[PDB]
Amino acid sequence: RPALFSGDPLVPWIVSAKSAGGLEAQRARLGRHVSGRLGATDLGYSLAATRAAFEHRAVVLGTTTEQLRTGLEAPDVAGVSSVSGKTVFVFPGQGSQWAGMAVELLDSSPVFAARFAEVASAVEAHVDWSVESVVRGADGTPSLDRIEILQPVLFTVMVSLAAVWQSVGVVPDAVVGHSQGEIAAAAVSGALSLGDAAQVVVLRSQLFADELVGKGAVASVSLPAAEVEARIARFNGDAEVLSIAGNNGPRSVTVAGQVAALEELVAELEAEGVRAKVIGSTVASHCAQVDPLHERILDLLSFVEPREGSVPLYSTVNGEVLSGAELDASYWFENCRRPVSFEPVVRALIADGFDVFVESSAHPVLTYGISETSDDVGVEVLAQGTLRRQEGGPRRVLTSFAEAWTRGVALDWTAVFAGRGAKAVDLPTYAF
């Protein structure tokens, strides 16, 4: 009963028809209708409540009915309904973050803010700062570039973003996480209590702040695993210095290890035109650097009481379909020690009849890998992000909703209008 949006955000006008020309005709008939009379938000509500959703779809965004009438000439999002399978929520690790993320959504979405408050309370049982204050960059707060601050803030943001989708009826049939993302995935599936998940992400990230910062990091590299193996061998003659930390798609991997070596590899790769980058604030998890921490991790996380969740969790640690009851301290050690097997799990999801992948994150980091993998398997899927860097408010949310819905995702657009005081108004008949 918190509304999705408060105040006076922009409005969506959703339109659909049975062909490309029919959708052009509907847009033209609406334009004429509006020119010749009408409240922007009443029309949006009416389009959402009173029209069938046919195959060819568009969404226009704006505030005034002039803006929205003008926009029918060039809708913000258009597509053709194509998905027909199950929905999995995707929770990435580090790489999502951007300066100022979540602030505008806290201010503009009561659904997001409410969930963010619940989850923040859970993490604040274990830290002495305020998650909201840190997110808002309040004076005196600790830096979000610190790993022990960032991971619990990312956790809070990813879990709370799943509630925004939930408010328009888009919910996971399964969940998949990447590295620390699995802790958010477990919180969403109910495999861990909010308290336990929060405490895991706080304590583990603090341990990493204490023992791994400066000793290593992780980089993304847009090459196939085999090619990257060939390029790192020269570093590893004596001991493991660099190692593949993740497989994200057929041409997308991550590499963990010593910072100097990692930077040398990234610069070499860039000089040959390859996209590569050190991921902000990362340490060298997912390699042998975490072995010395094994005993400490089991002691730190022994409190955890995992249980069978609402919805399965597709592990990127062991490639199993898990109930959630398995996610004990030993699991959370393996989660930070083993390379992330994300690409094989995407394959398995597609084979299990998933074709809607919703990345519940501040900036889409695994959607590219999901599409690339789906292309390799030869199956079309929707890989949809939530927010994006410097796009943090209602336009971005509505745009992501439109991107999903125009591709066939069932979405309850009527819920967007909660609290706006809208009413049904006359609309042109679908045909004369």
Side-chain angles (χ1 to χ4, degrees), residues 82-87 349 353-357 379-383:
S82 65
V83 303
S84 58
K86 293 157 81 154
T87 294
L349 286 161
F354 291 78
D355 66 357
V356 176
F357 290 72
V379 175
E380 260 218 350
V381 307
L382 170 70

Side-chain angles (χ1 to χ4, degrees), residues 57 72 148 191 193 268 281 294 296 303 315 381 430:
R57 295 177 183 191
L72 286 163
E148 71 272 28
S193 71
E268 180 179 296
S281 300
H294 191 174
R296 288 165 80 176
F303 66 82
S315 176
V381 307
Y430 183 87

Side-chain angles (χ1 to χ4, degrees), residues 182 315 317-318 322 326-335:
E182 285 204 329
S315 176
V317 180
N318 60 27
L322 299 179
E326 310 91 338
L327 276 18
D328 59 15
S330 281
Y331 187 83
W332 294 110
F333 175 72
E334 293 296 307
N335 165 271

Side-chain angles (χ1 to χ4, degrees), residues 15 22-36 51 72 427-432:
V15 196
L23 176 58
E24 191 80 40
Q26 289 307 133
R27 289 160 47 213
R29 289 167 62 78
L30 226 208
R32 280 190 184 189
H33 180 81
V34 176
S35 290
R51 289 291 215 242
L72 286 163
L427 293 167
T429 52
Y430 183 87
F432 84 88

Side-chain angles (χ1 to χ4, degrees), residues 9-314:
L10 78 176
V11 185
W13 280 5
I14 72 174
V15 196
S16 67
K18 301 182 198 201
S19 80
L23 176 58
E24 191 80 40
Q26 289 307 133
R27 289 160 47 213
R29 289 167 62 78
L30 226 208
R32 280 190 184 189
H33 180 81
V34 176
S35 290
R37 313 276 212 89
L38 288 180
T41 101
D42 293 338
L43 289 162
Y45 175 73
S46 299
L47 287 164
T50 76
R51 289 291 215 242
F54 298 128
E55 179 177 25
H56 292 251
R57 295 177 183 191
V59 179
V60 187
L61 306 176
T63 301
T64 69
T65 104
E66 260 313 286
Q67 284 165 343
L68 285 147
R69 185 184 59 77
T70 281
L72 286 163
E73 286 149 355
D76 302 79
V77 183
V80 177
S81 184
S82 65
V83 303
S84 58
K86 293 157 81 154
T87 294
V88 53
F89 276 39
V90 178
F91 297 87
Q94 260 165 78
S96 252
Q97 62 269 20
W98 50 273
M101 67 181 287
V103 178
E104 186 181 353
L105 199 57
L106 286 173
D107 290 335
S108 61
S109 176
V111 162
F112 181 71
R115 183 63 163 155
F116 182 110
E118 302 181 345
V119 178
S121 290
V123 347
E124 284 164 23
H126 304 288
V127 69
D128 106 98
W129 39 271
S130 158
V131 185
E132 182 167 19
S133 297
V134 162
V135 159
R136 295 185 179 275
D139 293 342
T141 54
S143 170
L144 264 175
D145 289 299
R146 290 166 53 194
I147 192 163
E148 71 272 28
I149 308 305
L150 183 60
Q151 295 198 6
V153 165
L154 254 21
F155 167 85
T156 69
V157 165
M158 280 190 299
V159 172
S160 303
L161 289 175
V164 170
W165 287 106
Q166 179 177 18
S167 84
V168 292
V170 175
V171 294
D173 300 309
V175 298
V176 187
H178 189 117
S179 193
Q180 66 191 258
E182 285 204 329
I183 303 164
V188 169
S189 76
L192 291 175
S193 71
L194 224 44
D196 277 357
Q199 192 174 357
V200 172
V201 71
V202 169
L203 291 180
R204 203 170 70 177
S205 64
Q206 186 61 62
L207 179 63
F208 290 176
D210 295 336
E211 312 284 339
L212 298 182
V213 167
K215 301 184 169 129
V218 175
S220 54
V221 175
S222 312
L223 288 175
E227 234 132 38
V228 177
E229 289 290 357
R231 298 221 191 1
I232 63 170
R234 69 176 175 90
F235 293 95
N236 294 331
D238 193 23
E240 183 185 285
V241 170
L242 298 183
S243 59
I244 290 190
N247 297 271
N248 285 356
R251 299 229 204 286
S252 170
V253 306
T254 56
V255 176
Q258 176 209 90
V259 175
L262 196 66
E263 293 177 341
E264 186 186 341
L265 176 71
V266 166
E268 180 179 296
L269 291 171
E270 186 163 304
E272 314 185 356
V274 171
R275 294 182 149 184
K277 156 193 182 188
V278 178
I279 297 170
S281 300
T282 53
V283 294
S285 40
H286 302 298
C287 70
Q289 289 198 30
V290 309
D291 282 322
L293 301 185
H294 191 174
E295 287 67 44
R296 288 165 80 176
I297 287 159
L298 300 186
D299 269 344
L300 233 12
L301 303 189
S302 58
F303 66 82
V304 175
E305 298 285 356
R307 68 266 176 120
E308 299 190 17
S310 272
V311 114
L313 180 23
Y314 277 65

